[PDB]
RNA sequence: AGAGGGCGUGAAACCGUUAAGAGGUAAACGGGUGGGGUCCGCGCAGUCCGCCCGGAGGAUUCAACCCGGCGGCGCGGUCC
RNA sequence: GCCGGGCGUGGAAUGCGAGUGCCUAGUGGGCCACUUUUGGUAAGCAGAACUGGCGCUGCGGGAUGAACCGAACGCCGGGU
RNA sequence: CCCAUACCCGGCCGUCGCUGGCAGUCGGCAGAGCGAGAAAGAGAGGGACGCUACGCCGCGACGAGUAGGAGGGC
């Protein structure tokens, strides 16, 4: 915590370094795609297969 | 990476990506920037206009330090001082205006490129423009010279 | 008495002969491996009648039977007994093949282990 | 997390082996040994693993508890089963179906256990 | 020729970025397995021992 | 024998990002799902913009989005930009903002959050607004790069105010014959 | 990372002592193999000897 | 010694020999079949897999309970 | 030249998704034919116009054939 | 009446397109649908396979090639 520091406490033993930021907080999209917020805004899966 | 280059995919192909008719000879058009007034005339008119000729006065012993004058715009003028300075003036009620020493930051000339927050300053610069002086006066500040 | 595969479909190949390099018969320096002729007058290149055939993608085998042995299996090279526990769940689709440099004392450990796991081996009767 | 770590090991891991136009994973708790997201044992928080018994008779079923997630010494719980074929299948079916523990793996783990039990059946 | 460009230079922030991404993956008990390491019995992955 | 031209039947467009960034590649997995199972055409634009190269998603300045959010029928909606939000030092006051960008510079976080704002990421955007309802999708200045000042008609052409490529600028670099009416001609 | 868990220090003989160290925030940094594979295959070129 | 004093491995061109086949439009080749060898198929009485019925067995034997242990989930509608 | 307001039966037929910006290789010896056509006694000659060919192209036909007539090519079975 | 690598029909390969479809494997916390010509609501007061998502699947159309260009090479 002194060579790289937390996100809100810059590293003490570096000049002005701080940890990189995350491009997406909630990483596991499995826990995302099965959420009531998403699952209410989706059209029904058209999975009946249509062959020639 | 030689394994990513094009020559790996040209193995087997005879001319190696340079044509059979117009083979890859040594120097078809001449070496360097040749033929400026000649067979390469169109390329120099169409893409380097003004390449040929002289204009102006030949200044002999140019010492770049004499003509040194790095400008600063009024847009980023308050960035030369800390945010504590900028807030403590709009909070101050005595009309006490902070002094921005431009020369200390590294610039010499002040040019007025944009808006200013309406709170007075006394910019300690070395050169000013006309419009730059107007903005600082119109806000309510002063323009002090220094050498 | 063999370990029959899942399904044994009729394999059908669009071509069974190899493709030979042009003029590979007339020379010994010209090896049999296919090289596309790039000459400007080459007959084979410009598809003349009654010449050597150039391989196109139109000869592609069916994806349902691609890489499939005549025995209805698909090979998988195996080096030791530990590389067999992979194939214990593909018994009816993927056969096992012991690699060349596997010694004779290690081959008679793989084959009966592959007899326990019911995996077919394509080279069981080895050096022995 | 699970979806994250899969991207790190989808194509570079010591358990992945690719040859003969196929792809396999030699992971410990990876029934079907397939290089898949569903079947990877290292990735998920709840995995199922069916290995042969240590003596050579029976199966052990490996579940992964949810408490110890970065403590691998205690995470995996193993239960040795040595019963008949219809009873061993029903015991590992109830640990999955009636515990809601990867219910998309009940039939897949039943095949592996049945395949192990048939292996431990005497050879012809 | 001896003056082929052998040495390469990388930005100091990316050098520090790679240390961050390397240390964080040494905290997931799954990536350390896939790197090969036989740690199926180690007590806790970010293993810390005494100063003794 | 069919009388057609196969010249341009293979449409040139990105179908997945050339970047190998797995966090970026995880977002695309999320928005590929949202693009095809919601009729909202918002997610299709965000999906298309996640594929693009950095030169096609230029940075949005901080003052530019302030300029576009002070427009009337707004100031409750959320700022969504696929590029990155850089801090603009030439603006003084900062309204409170609800921002969703791929990456926010360290100073632009501290200046937004000090104004009581809110910074979102695209996984949190889908949780708070799946169909993109109540958002304003913005983009930085695409042709603001220095490169486009060399494009267009060639210099040395009538009314072709195009920057030429010169190794250094001075009184004796492309100030002669093509430019002065006293030296030959000019355009 | 809504929280940082608590790591336990182990003694010299394998037991877990009473102390507990907070997980440093560097272990929560983003996992970027593309950067690691970039930096590694450009810093390995700096120990290289010339040959000609 | 199938390592025999320029001797590890011992390729091709080329040559000798043996075995097989052929032979008046130079040879060689493409496509298509046919014949003949070559070895291989360890080919030669040809499927196993469930499920239920019928007939002969053999176990320590099912269900439901009792005690111990481990695990999962908890909207305990709001546990500490 | 500005505002402001009002009018869609989308004001010929047919067909087809378009617009747009970078970077850019090869080429810059061509040749033939119907028709028009200049020089020449004429030429498988020299020089042009328009369109299509050949070059970069196999295939069926003209015995043979760079260009003629038909028709343009993934690998196959049937029909025409 | 004869036959081309042309046309029709059928198979297979590949490319291109639909910027096509699939996270819904939602199971005694269960109830098996979204092929439906018609801008919108099955709204509340013990059970095969699968989905290396850089994966899998379905439809159409298309396929000559020197110089040259690019893509993929388990």
PDB file of N, CA and C in Angstrom, chain E residues 1-2 4-11 14-15 17-28 31 43-44 46-52, chain G residues 6-12 14 17 19 21 23 26-33 35-36 38-39 42-43 45-52:
ATOM      1  N   UNK E   1      24.398  -6.301 -38.605  1.00  0.00           N
ATOM      2  CA  UNK E   1      25.228  -5.238 -38.073  1.00  0.00           C
ATOM      3  C   UNK E   1      25.039  -5.144 -36.572  1.00  0.00           C
ATOM      4  N   UNK E   2      26.095  -4.733 -35.870  1.00  0.00           N
ATOM      5  CA  UNK E   2      26.013  -4.594 -34.425  1.00  0.00           C
ATOM      6  C   UNK E   2      25.038  -3.510 -34.009  1.00  0.00           C
ATOM      7  N   UNK E   4      22.024  -2.988 -34.968  1.00  0.00           N
ATOM      8  CA  UNK E   4      20.610  -3.291 -34.980  1.00  0.00           C
ATOM      9  C   UNK E   4      19.995  -2.812 -33.674  1.00  0.00           C
ATOM     10  N   UNK E   5      18.739  -2.400 -33.733  1.00  0.00           N
ATOM     11  CA  UNK E   5      18.068  -1.896 -32.541  1.00  0.00           C
ATOM     12  C   UNK E   5      17.710  -3.078 -31.653  1.00  0.00           C
ATOM     13  N   UNK E   6      18.581  -3.392 -30.696  1.00  0.00           N
ATOM     14  CA  UNK E   6      18.306  -4.494 -29.777  1.00  0.00           C
ATOM     15  C   UNK E   6      17.332  -4.068 -28.686  1.00  0.00           C
ATOM     16  N   UNK E   7      17.701  -3.053 -27.914  1.00  0.00           N
ATOM     17  CA  UNK E   7      16.946  -2.699 -26.722  1.00  0.00           C
ATOM     18  C   UNK E   7      15.686  -1.921 -27.069  1.00  0.00           C
ATOM     19  N   UNK E   8      14.618  -2.186 -26.328  1.00  0.00           N
ATOM     20  CA  UNK E   8      13.363  -1.468 -26.463  1.00  0.00           C
ATOM     21  C   UNK E   8      13.058  -0.727 -25.173  1.00  0.00           C
ATOM     22  N   UNK E   9      12.282   0.347 -25.283  1.00  0.00           N
ATOM     23  CA  UNK E   9      11.874   1.124 -24.126  1.00  0.00           C
ATOM     24  C   UNK E   9      10.359   1.158 -24.020  1.00  0.00           C
ATOM     25  N   UNK E  10       9.870   1.083 -22.788  1.00  0.00           N
ATOM     26  CA  UNK E  10       8.445   1.039 -22.495  1.00  0.00           C
ATOM     27  C   UNK E  10       8.145   2.169 -21.524  1.00  0.00           C
ATOM     28  N   UNK E  11       6.974   2.790 -21.675  1.00  0.00           N
ATOM     29  CA  UNK E  11       6.557   3.882 -20.806  1.00  0.00           C
ATOM     30  C   UNK E  11       6.550   3.445 -19.351  1.00  0.00           C
ATOM     31  N   UNK E  14       3.274   2.085 -18.059  1.00  0.00           N
ATOM     32  CA  UNK E  14       2.938   0.740 -18.509  1.00  0.00           C
ATOM     33  C   UNK E  14       3.776  -0.302 -17.790  1.00  0.00           C
ATOM     34  N   UNK E  15       5.039   0.017 -17.516  1.00  0.00           N
ATOM     35  CA  UNK E  15       5.851  -0.848 -16.672  1.00  0.00           C
ATOM     36  C   UNK E  15       5.202  -1.036 -15.315  1.00  0.00           C
ATOM     37  N   UNK E  17       2.016  -0.567 -14.811  1.00  0.00           N
ATOM     38  CA  UNK E  17       0.748  -1.228 -15.089  1.00  0.00           C
ATOM     39  C   UNK E  17       0.917  -2.736 -15.088  1.00  0.00           C
ATOM     40  N   UNK E  18       2.014  -3.220 -15.665  1.00  0.00           N
ATOM     41  CA  UNK E  18       2.210  -4.656 -15.782  1.00  0.00           C
ATOM     42  C   UNK E  18       2.458  -5.288 -14.425  1.00  0.00           C
ATOM     43  N   UNK E  19       3.084  -4.553 -13.511  1.00  0.00           N
ATOM     44  CA  UNK E  19       3.278  -5.074 -12.164  1.00  0.00           C
ATOM     45  C   UNK E  19       1.945  -5.196 -11.450  1.00  0.00           C
ATOM     46  N   UNK E  20       1.058  -4.224 -11.656  1.00  0.00           N
ATOM     47  CA  UNK E  20      -0.274  -4.288 -11.070  1.00  0.00           C
ATOM     48  C   UNK E  20      -1.035  -5.497 -11.587  1.00  0.00           C
ATOM     49  N   UNK E  21      -1.032  -5.690 -12.903  1.00  0.00           N
ATOM     50  CA  UNK E  21      -1.759  -6.809 -13.478  1.00  0.00           C
ATOM     51  C   UNK E  21      -1.107  -8.138 -13.138  1.00  0.00           C
ATOM     52  N   UNK E  22       0.188  -8.135 -12.840  1.00  0.00           N
ATOM     53  CA  UNK E  22       0.844  -9.382 -12.474  1.00  0.00           C
ATOM     54  C   UNK E  22       0.556  -9.751 -11.032  1.00  0.00           C
ATOM     55  N   UNK E  23       0.576  -8.771 -10.134  1.00  0.00           N
ATOM     56  CA  UNK E  23       0.350  -9.066  -8.727  1.00  0.00           C
ATOM     57  C   UNK E  23      -1.091  -9.466  -8.482  1.00  0.00           C
ATOM     58  N   UNK E  24      -2.027  -8.808  -9.160  1.00  0.00           N
ATOM     59  CA  UNK E  24      -3.435  -9.106  -8.944  1.00  0.00           C
ATOM     60  C   UNK E  24      -3.791 -10.505  -9.416  1.00  0.00           C
ATOM     61  N   UNK E  25      -3.151 -10.980 -10.481  1.00  0.00           N
ATOM     62  CA  UNK E  25      -3.403 -12.337 -10.940  1.00  0.00           C
ATOM     63  C   UNK E  25      -2.713 -13.378 -10.080  1.00  0.00           C
ATOM     64  N   UNK E  26      -1.768 -12.973  -9.246  1.00  0.00           N
ATOM     65  CA  UNK E  26      -1.203 -13.859  -8.246  1.00  0.00           C
ATOM     66  C   UNK E  26      -2.055 -13.918  -6.992  1.00  0.00           C
ATOM     67  N   UNK E  27      -3.227 -13.294  -7.009  1.00  0.00           N
ATOM     68  CA  UNK E  27      -4.171 -13.377  -5.911  1.00  0.00           C
ATOM     69  C   UNK E  27      -5.397 -14.199  -6.253  1.00  0.00           C
ATOM     70  N   UNK E  28      -5.544 -14.615  -7.500  1.00  0.00           N
ATOM     71  CA  UNK E  28      -6.660 -15.455  -7.885  1.00  0.00           C
ATOM     72  C   UNK E  28      -6.194 -16.895  -7.851  1.00  0.00           C
ATOM     73  N   UNK E  31      -5.801 -18.611 -11.629  1.00  0.00           N
ATOM     74  CA  UNK E  31      -4.773 -18.334 -12.619  1.00  0.00           C
ATOM     75  C   UNK E  31      -3.438 -18.914 -12.200  1.00  0.00           C
ATOM     76  N   UNK E  43      -2.563 -23.318   2.082  1.00  0.00           N
ATOM     77  CA  UNK E  43      -3.671 -22.804   2.898  1.00  0.00           C
ATOM     78  C   UNK E  43      -4.414 -21.611   2.318  1.00  0.00           C
ATOM     79  N   UNK E  44      -3.723 -20.518   2.020  1.00  0.00           N
ATOM     80  CA  UNK E  44      -4.369 -19.363   1.415  1.00  0.00           C
ATOM     81  C   UNK E  44      -3.441 -18.805   0.354  1.00  0.00           C
ATOM     82  N   UNK E  46      -2.788 -15.619  -1.254  1.00  0.00           N
ATOM     83  CA  UNK E  46      -1.847 -14.529  -0.963  1.00  0.00           C
ATOM     84  C   UNK E  46      -1.053 -14.837   0.293  1.00  0.00           C
ATOM     85  N   UNK E  47      -0.190 -15.843   0.193  1.00  0.00           N
ATOM     86  CA  UNK E  47       0.493 -16.441   1.325  1.00  0.00           C
ATOM     87  C   UNK E  47       1.441 -15.456   1.979  1.00  0.00           C
ATOM     88  N   UNK E  48       1.186 -15.157   3.241  1.00  0.00           N
ATOM     89  CA  UNK E  48       2.034 -14.262   4.007  1.00  0.00           C
ATOM     90  C   UNK E  48       2.612 -15.036   5.177  1.00  0.00           C
ATOM     91  N   UNK E  49       3.927 -14.950   5.333  1.00  0.00           N
ATOM     92  CA  UNK E  49       4.612 -15.651   6.405  1.00  0.00           C
ATOM     93  C   UNK E  49       5.200 -14.617   7.346  1.00  0.00           C
ATOM     94  N   UNK E  50       5.613 -15.076   8.521  1.00  0.00           N
ATOM     95  CA  UNK E  50       6.102 -14.170   9.548  1.00  0.00           C
ATOM     96  C   UNK E  50       7.436 -13.559   9.149  1.00  0.00           C
ATOM     97  N   UNK E  51       7.795 -12.473   9.827  1.00  0.00           N
ATOM     98  CA  UNK E  51       9.071 -11.812   9.599  1.00  0.00           C
ATOM     99  C   UNK E  51      10.246 -12.621  10.127  1.00  0.00           C
ATOM    100  N   UNK E  52       9.991 -13.714  10.843  1.00  0.00           N
ATOM    101  CA  UNK E  52      11.070 -14.548  11.347  1.00  0.00           C
ATOM    102  C   UNK E  52      11.821 -15.265  10.236  1.00  0.00           C
TER     103      UNK E  52
ATOM    104  N   UNK G   6      -9.600 -10.050   4.336  1.00  0.00           N
ATOM    105  CA  UNK G   6      -8.595 -10.000   5.387  1.00  0.00           C
ATOM    106  C   UNK G   6      -7.704 -11.226   5.280  1.00  0.00           C
ATOM    107  N   UNK G   7      -6.432 -11.006   5.051  1.00  0.00           N
ATOM    108  CA  UNK G   7      -5.474 -12.087   4.865  1.00  0.00           C
ATOM    109  C   UNK G   7      -4.805 -12.389   6.195  1.00  0.00           C
ATOM    110  N   UNK G   8      -4.571 -13.670   6.453  1.00  0.00           N
ATOM    111  CA  UNK G   8      -3.999 -14.137   7.708  1.00  0.00           C
ATOM    112  C   UNK G   8      -2.538 -14.505   7.503  1.00  0.00           C
ATOM    113  N   UNK G   9      -1.685 -14.039   8.400  1.00  0.00           N
ATOM    114  CA  UNK G   9      -0.269 -14.378   8.357  1.00  0.00           C
ATOM    115  C   UNK G   9      -0.071 -15.766   8.943  1.00  0.00           C
ATOM    116  N   UNK G  10       0.772 -16.558   8.295  1.00  0.00           N
ATOM    117  CA  UNK G  10       1.070 -17.900   8.755  1.00  0.00           C
ATOM    118  C   UNK G  10       2.433 -17.926   9.424  1.00  0.00           C
ATOM    119  N   UNK G  11       2.537 -18.720  10.482  1.00  0.00           N
ATOM    120  CA  UNK G  11       3.776 -18.826  11.227  1.00  0.00           C
ATOM    121  C   UNK G  11       4.765 -19.700  10.469  1.00  0.00           C
ATOM    122  N   UNK G  12       5.945 -19.883  11.056  1.00  0.00           N
ATOM    123  CA  UNK G  12       7.000 -20.640  10.399  1.00  0.00           C
ATOM    124  C   UNK G  12       6.688 -22.123  10.285  1.00  0.00           C
ATOM    125  N   UNK G  14       3.492 -23.472   9.805  1.00  0.00           N
ATOM    126  CA  UNK G  14       2.317 -23.739   9.002  1.00  0.00           C
ATOM    127  C   UNK G  14       1.008 -23.326   9.633  1.00  0.00           C
ATOM    128  N   UNK G  17      -1.395 -17.639  12.602  1.00  0.00           N
ATOM    129  CA  UNK G  17      -1.260 -16.854  13.821  1.00  0.00           C
ATOM    130  C   UNK G  17      -2.514 -16.005  14.028  1.00  0.00           C
ATOM    131  N   UNK G  19      -2.641 -12.683  13.922  1.00  0.00           N
ATOM    132  CA  UNK G  19      -2.633 -11.453  13.144  1.00  0.00           C
ATOM    133  C   UNK G  19      -3.387 -11.626  11.834  1.00  0.00           C
ATOM    134  N   UNK G  21      -3.833  -9.295   8.105  1.00  0.00           N
ATOM    135  CA  UNK G  21      -3.423  -8.133   7.326  1.00  0.00           C
ATOM    136  C   UNK G  21      -4.484  -7.843   6.277  1.00  0.00           C
ATOM    137  N   UNK G  23      -6.048  -6.934   2.833  1.00  0.00           N
ATOM    138  CA  UNK G  23      -5.625  -7.188   1.466  1.00  0.00           C
ATOM    139  C   UNK G  23      -5.287  -5.877   0.775  1.00  0.00           C
ATOM    140  N   UNK G  26      -3.658  -3.264  -4.509  1.00  0.00           N
ATOM    141  CA  UNK G  26      -2.996  -3.605  -5.765  1.00  0.00           C
ATOM    142  C   UNK G  26      -3.502  -4.944  -6.288  1.00  0.00           C
ATOM    143  N   UNK G  27      -3.917  -5.829  -5.385  1.00  0.00           N
ATOM    144  CA  UNK G  27      -4.408  -7.135  -5.795  1.00  0.00           C
ATOM    145  C   UNK G  27      -5.792  -7.040  -6.414  1.00  0.00           C
ATOM    146  N   UNK G  28      -6.398  -5.862  -6.364  1.00  0.00           N
ATOM    147  CA  UNK G  28      -7.685  -5.639  -6.990  1.00  0.00           C
ATOM    148  C   UNK G  28      -7.592  -4.868  -8.295  1.00  0.00           C
ATOM    149  N   UNK G  29      -6.386  -4.603  -8.788  1.00  0.00           N
ATOM    150  CA  UNK G  29      -6.143  -3.875 -10.028  1.00  0.00           C
ATOM    151  C   UNK G  29      -6.718  -4.637 -11.214  1.00  0.00           C
ATOM    152  N   UNK G  30      -6.918  -3.998 -12.365  1.00  0.00           N
ATOM    153  CA  UNK G  30      -7.418  -4.737 -13.529  1.00  0.00           C
ATOM    154  C   UNK G  30      -6.413  -5.759 -14.029  1.00  0.00           C
ATOM    155  N   UNK G  31      -6.934  -6.866 -14.541  1.00  0.00           N
ATOM    156  CA  UNK G  31      -6.111  -7.952 -15.055  1.00  0.00           C
ATOM    157  C   UNK G  31      -5.984  -7.758 -16.556  1.00  0.00           C
ATOM    158  N   UNK G  32      -4.796  -7.382 -17.015  1.00  0.00           N
ATOM    159  CA  UNK G  32      -4.573  -7.057 -18.420  1.00  0.00           C
ATOM    160  C   UNK G  32      -3.463  -7.940 -18.963  1.00  0.00           C
ATOM    161  N   UNK G  33      -3.796  -9.081 -19.566  1.00  0.00           N
ATOM    162  CA  UNK G  33      -2.745  -9.909 -20.165  1.00  0.00           C
ATOM    163  C   UNK G  33      -2.119  -9.256 -21.373  1.00  0.00           C
ATOM    164  N   UNK G  35      -1.385  -6.189 -21.880  1.00  0.00           N
ATOM    165  CA  UNK G  35      -0.320  -5.283 -21.475  1.00  0.00           C
ATOM    166  C   UNK G  35       0.861  -6.066 -20.932  1.00  0.00           C
ATOM    167  N   UNK G  36       0.580  -7.077 -20.110  1.00  0.00           N
ATOM    168  CA  UNK G  36       1.627  -7.938 -19.572  1.00  0.00           C
ATOM    169  C   UNK G  36       2.379  -8.621 -20.699  1.00  0.00           C
ATOM    170  N   UNK G  38       2.578  -7.482 -23.650  1.00  0.00           N
ATOM    171  CA  UNK G  38       3.283  -6.434 -24.379  1.00  0.00           C
ATOM    172  C   UNK G  38       4.575  -6.058 -23.671  1.00  0.00           C
ATOM    173  N   UNK G  39       4.490  -5.809 -22.367  1.00  0.00           N
ATOM    174  CA  UNK G  39       5.641  -5.329 -21.614  1.00  0.00           C
ATOM    175  C   UNK G  39       6.685  -6.424 -21.478  1.00  0.00           C
ATOM    176  N   UNK G  42       8.848  -6.942 -24.546  1.00  0.00           N
ATOM    177  CA  UNK G  42       9.670  -5.803 -24.909  1.00  0.00           C
ATOM    178  C   UNK G  42      10.709  -5.478 -23.867  1.00  0.00           C
ATOM    179  N   UNK G  43      10.585  -5.977 -22.647  1.00  0.00           N
ATOM    180  CA  UNK G  43      11.661  -5.862 -21.686  1.00  0.00           C
ATOM    181  C   UNK G  43      12.602  -7.047 -21.721  1.00  0.00           C
ATOM    182  N   UNK G  45      13.935  -7.912 -24.343  1.00  0.00           N
ATOM    183  CA  UNK G  45      14.898  -7.551 -25.356  1.00  0.00           C
ATOM    184  C   UNK G  45      15.981  -6.623 -24.839  1.00  0.00           C
ATOM    185  N   UNK G  46      15.976  -6.281 -23.555  1.00  0.00           N
ATOM    186  CA  UNK G  46      16.976  -5.339 -23.072  1.00  0.00           C
ATOM    187  C   UNK G  46      18.175  -6.023 -22.445  1.00  0.00           C
ATOM    188  N   UNK G  47      18.059  -7.290 -22.070  1.00  0.00           N
ATOM    189  CA  UNK G  47      19.232  -8.006 -21.593  1.00  0.00           C
ATOM    190  C   UNK G  47      20.037  -8.605 -22.728  1.00  0.00           C
ATOM    191  N   UNK G  48      19.555  -8.476 -23.957  1.00  0.00           N
ATOM    192  CA  UNK G  48      20.131  -9.173 -25.093  1.00  0.00           C
ATOM    193  C   UNK G  48      21.471  -8.574 -25.488  1.00  0.00           C
ATOM    194  N   UNK G  49      22.461  -9.438 -25.706  1.00  0.00           N
ATOM    195  CA  UNK G  49      23.805  -9.222 -26.230  1.00  0.00           C
ATOM    196  C   UNK G  49      23.736  -8.978 -27.728  1.00  0.00           C
ATOM    197  N   UNK G  50      24.638  -8.192 -28.292  1.00  0.00           N
ATOM    198  CA  UNK G  50      24.650  -8.023 -29.742  1.00  0.00           C
ATOM    199  C   UNK G  50      25.338  -9.192 -30.413  1.00  0.00           C
ATOM    200  N   UNK G  51      25.045  -9.371 -31.695  1.00  0.00           N
ATOM    201  CA  UNK G  51      25.763 -10.345 -32.498  1.00  0.00           C
ATOM    202  C   UNK G  51      25.772  -9.866 -33.936  1.00  0.00           C
ATOM    203  N   UNK G  52      26.863 -10.141 -34.641  1.00  0.00           N
ATOM    204  CA  UNK G  52      26.990  -9.690 -36.014  1.00  0.00           C
ATOM    205  C   UNK G  52      28.066 -10.484 -36.725  1.00  0.00           C
TER     206      UNK G  52
END
